[PDB]
Ligand binder design. Sequence first.
Ligand code: HEM
Ligand SMILES: C[C@@H]1CO[C@@](Cn2cncn2)(c2ccc(Oc3ccc(Cl)cc3)cc2Cl)O1
Length: 529
Amino acid sequence: SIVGEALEYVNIGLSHFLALPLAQRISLIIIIPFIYNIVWQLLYSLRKDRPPLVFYWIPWVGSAVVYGMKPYEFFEECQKKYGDIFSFVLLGRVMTVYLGPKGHEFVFNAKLADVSAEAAYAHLTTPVFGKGVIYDCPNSRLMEQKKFVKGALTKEAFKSYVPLIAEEVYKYFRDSKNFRLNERTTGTIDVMVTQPEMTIFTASRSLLGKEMRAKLDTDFAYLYSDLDKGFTPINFVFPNLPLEHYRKRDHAQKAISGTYMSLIKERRKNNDIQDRDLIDSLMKNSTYKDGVKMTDQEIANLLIGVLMGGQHTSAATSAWILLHLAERPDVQQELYEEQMRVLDGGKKELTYDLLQEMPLLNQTIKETLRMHHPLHSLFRKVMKDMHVPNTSYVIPAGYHVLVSPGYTHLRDEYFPNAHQFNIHRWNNDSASSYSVGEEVDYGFGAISKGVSSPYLPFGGGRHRCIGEHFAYCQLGVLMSIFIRTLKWHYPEGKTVPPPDFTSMVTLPTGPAKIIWEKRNPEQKIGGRH
Ligand code: HEM
Ligand SMILES: C[C@@H]1CO[C@@](Cn2cncn2)(c2ccc(Oc3ccc(Cl)cc3)cc2Cl)O1
């Protein structure tokens, strides 16, 4: 009864392995891991403390291809197969999706020890924005940075911004080659060209100030284009490989951040610290509660983060608003009547107050954000094993949880006819969001305690957006002026493009063109150029 007989042949077997032709070693190095993860998945499927894991053929890659291309379709299939909790493998990671209001509650209100937003995002954002801020710092510092940024975003701030944002829109109509309203009465624009430029011009002028706005009329603008391109989903897998767009990214980050510090330091040494923009505001108020101040570099990187995050959400949203209204002249007609009423047929200048008396305009933003959430997925890295309540599931640490409020936005269950663009579903309900009950404060002010609203455009919980009022102000002024100046429609046989999900921001697949006409061909925008 000898067992060695075989253990010898284990050893012999290993030696015949090392000596196979390289033709076959490569083959074996491919077939053996392939077979291994198919065996592992069938085995994983028997654990009852695990959400179902979407089956996948290629290891490591996982379901990345279909997830990246059509994530909402991927969610609906996996939801029909396995229900509202499931996992799937994604470019090296396991994502545990939790669909629906309960998923919102499980992830957005997760405990600070269970999940980390900075662990999921810092690789994507820190090379773009800079160091020491946002996701390159502990959550407590985040909460106080949001407290600083919010302080420049007050109602009195927004009254200053409305005329500046409006001056910027008119100047863009006057001077941009896509309009030139003093020279042409009709034209064709790509909204994916016009809207990003309008967003940065209005955002720069109002948040950063006139100096920073002015710099975008020079070769400097290309640095924002550079810094923009470093903000790419393959920052999320290959974040610092030594290619050149990784360098123009880091150069633009250094160069842009340098410009803000120059202005900051020049204001402190001229004592020229007013209340004109977010730069004055962060200068006067950026000391943490433990007494540490933000450095001028940390302040500037927080500005890059503000402008950059606002840039992509806002520009995509005004692009969808225009594309949706391009086939709804009835809605343009209704929005134009409200403009005429609230503003005495133009004999009243637009103020932040009159903006709040325009519920149908605000309903259009509301509705566009329901059909086109700019972020289809939000993530956390799981730090501690989490038991999914009223199940037997344990999400072990090292997984990621993925919440997707914009998927629920498109469910007939929660929005009758969810795929119709209908601003009237928000009749007497035009608030950008509503704290439907009890509130909580995480460091940056009282926000809703529950995050179980099926309309959750701005998320909830500690990582909840603080830009919604700024975005409504900016989009509000922009669309008010658009509506009062132009009608617009599609070229023959064109309609609303489908969303290009691969940028992770749900942009219209460009080119997305509209044809605009002047409501008053003979009208002239003033000022010099
Ligand atoms: C249509 C406009 C916008 C939408 C739909 C939107 C959406 C969101 C969402 C869903 C989050 C939560 C992310 C998460 O929990 O994983 C968020 C966070 C945030 N957003 Fe917005 N956003 C918009 C505009 C803006 C603007 C214009 C700004 C700046 C002026 C801004 C600044 C922020 C900040 C600072 C956070 C904090 C993230 C954190 O605390 O980790 N957002 N936004
Ligand atoms: C992955 C993350 C989730 O949300 C965003 C996208 N976004 C959301 N609203 C606007 N942009 C995002 C959110 C905020 C942000 O910038 C700041 C600015 C100030 C503070 Cl105090 C904190 C952060 C940058 C991004 Cl890129 O990406």
